[model samples]
Target: KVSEQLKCCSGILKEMFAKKHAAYAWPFYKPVDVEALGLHDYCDIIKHPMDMSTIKSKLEAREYRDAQEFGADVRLMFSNCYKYNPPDHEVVAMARKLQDVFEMRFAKMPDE
Candidate 1:
């Protein structure tokens, strides 16, 4: 049933982040605009930036061991934002809200 687990969780993940809300998926859906934002130092600060676009690509390519590894990338996306952005920043709050939504849905995913 591991395949089933991955499929179900994948669906949950896909639908969740595709929400496109300003305080949710909108900020996390793509990589940060390092050059455009003049925050080129972002690469030095957040060595491993993650985004939903990359995560979804990885899932489609079967690059993850399972949902746990997928979860790792998802968490990394937020943690990277937290590391680079101030806690009081607007996007920081959005990341928190998006992570909260993910956590609740991930809870119902079948255990492998």
Candidate 2:
């Protein structure tokens, strides 16, 4: 359960950074700030605890499969978060859900 939460939070952070919302991401600001910045629903997800260094190491070791699994968990959480917050004027909620499912599809399939 804890691992699932970690995966979900990490994934959300990954998306936020990748999408250039670094200023609103955790560590950059407080939970209240994140909420004020229009991402309040994601506060809990960003707060989820996990050893980021361990995940980084796994990625560095070329463990793409595991990484995908972790990403899937993250996306799943994002999808749930969206259900409450939803996007301002887009289908981001659907996107996250699709992304989660897509990641799951490749979770244990052949890849290199």
TM-score of each: 0.90, 0.33
Write model 1 residue lDDT over 1-112, tens digit each, in one string: 6787789768867776664544467977788889998898999999898898898899889898777888889999989999998899988888888888888888888775
lDDT of 1 at 18: 64
Cα displacement (angstroms), candidate 2, residue 40, comes to: 4.3
For residues 61-90, write the lDDT of model 2, one tens digit per residue.
545454455565445445544554548734
Residue 96 accuracy (lDDT) in model 2: 52
Relative to the true structure, how large is the alpha-carbon lDDT of every model? 0.83, 0.46
What's the lDDT for candidate 1?
Answer: 0.83
Residue 62, candidate 2: Cα error in Å is 6.7
Mark the regions of model 1 whose C-alpha exceeds 4 Å error after superposition.
20-23
The superposed Cα distance between candidate 1 and the true structure at residue 82, in angstroms, equals 0.6
**Clashing residue pairs in candidate 2, if any?**
8-74
